[PDB]
Amino acid sequence: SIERLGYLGFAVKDVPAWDHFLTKSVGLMAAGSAGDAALYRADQRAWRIAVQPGELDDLAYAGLEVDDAAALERMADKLRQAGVAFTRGDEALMQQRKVMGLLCLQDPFGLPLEIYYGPAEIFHEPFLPSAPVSGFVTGDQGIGHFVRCVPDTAKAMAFYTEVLGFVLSDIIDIQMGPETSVPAHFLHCNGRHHTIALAAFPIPKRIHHFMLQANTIDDVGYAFDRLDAAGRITSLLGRHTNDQTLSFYADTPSPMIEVEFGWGPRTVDSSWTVARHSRTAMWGHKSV
Template sequence: MSVKSLGYMGFAVKDVSAWRSFLTQKLGLMDAGVTDDGALFRIDSRAWRIAVQQGEADDLAYAGYEVADAAGLTQMTEKLRQAGIEVVTGDVELAKRRGVMGLISFADPFGLPLEIYYGASEVFEKPFMPGAAVSGFLTGEQGLGHFVRCVPDSEKALAFYTQVLGFQLSDVIDMKMGPDVTVPAYFLHCNERHHTLAIAAFPLPKRIHHFMLEVSSLNDVGFAFDRLDADGLITSTLGCHTNDHMVSFYAATPSGVEVEYGWAARTIDRSWVVARHDSPSMWGHKSVRNKA
């Protein structure tokens, strides 16, 4: 039993207004209004995918993983409790705020609040209208995208996400952090998206290094690059990753957490075998900050 996809993310930030402008005018998300969960944003037919609420953390506040139905939620609840994880069944009010039929709440081994839910709200009658030039985002069975979780003990986190939540290892990249320092990054999938989650013991103050959105065309990437570059927000140049082959760039959000914006990642199929890589990129992804 495994979760099926990353369904939504919620951020707690100091400047909600700056995030609203960033997500809509720079990344092309659709403003879906304000609720008790904060400002909501769409990238497809779902009522929302990203929420931004007022908070001092300037970080990811929670993430929601989707299962197919009530039976799947019950199975995941039992699996978590058998693993000794404290699980709270979401009440009617929380389910209403999230726009789902049912959910549970718990935390990963290093304190990131997680939710598993089923029955998300679809709003096909309200077509997705991007806030900036973008032809569309890749979601569907692949879910929202991915994020890279920063943890002090990657082996402990890896055990939780694979043995309890059911993720599977796609591959490993040995990240060279210095002349004599290498940190392995583990890339995990729960559907055909190459990775919905990556785990690494990066010495960073945030819960995540970045989150990723995948768009429908190379031009979408290029137009977004120009919009963000005009404001000096690019943190790494266009490049192509060694493992998922995505063509992407990275930019700074108003909270310092980065966003990866990419296109054309390869997907997982039945013939997939685990591999390791010595470098994260075949070409590009040169740090802009280091040149400043």
């Protein structure tokens, strides 16, 4: 079973715009480069987000983390049993990602996934944000979450839960029109209420947004003003019905992909109960 989401790689048309966005607006720390990919940090890991030039303007891959070598072999066993194709990353890839081992595969709809273990940490180069943010909530909960767009939620659910070991937290019927709603399924693989949400949205992107969680409410408030100064705000502040994350949304430089920046959600444990919600926000989140 996947333990947490550890990294994201984007392929974008405007690297300089993404660079400014991730550092000056979001607050991530610039962390050099690996080949043609620019690297960004949010904590002690050598990198958390990679940005490389490309026409996709989308998520290129997502790194799914396990706790040790044996766990990785067990995942390989699960993939084999499920008939899911995969390739072991070679030395060059391991060195590029800074991991001790990885399996390369795709989800049922073409998103490359990399299951890995043994990521590099660099405590001798302590994290220093590029903008005022006290810090990000990562650790055992991983880097954050993202919404995976899919054409068949049922099929997507079978793969993420039966193969990768994610678990359903809850469902929100997200209103699309006067008489049309999309049942978004929010999935956890640790204490983070959701690490991946599945939704049949009509957008031409692999993902709808990625989310980062900051330590304080002020972190979120200040970030709002920075993104507003950049003219990127897509929602006012609000708080979600399901995880109680207080956040706002903004456009990334890649069309139709947003970032969510939030604080203070509830966490999940073994006693979690599946529920359904008719709205995404308990309050706020008006679209701008």
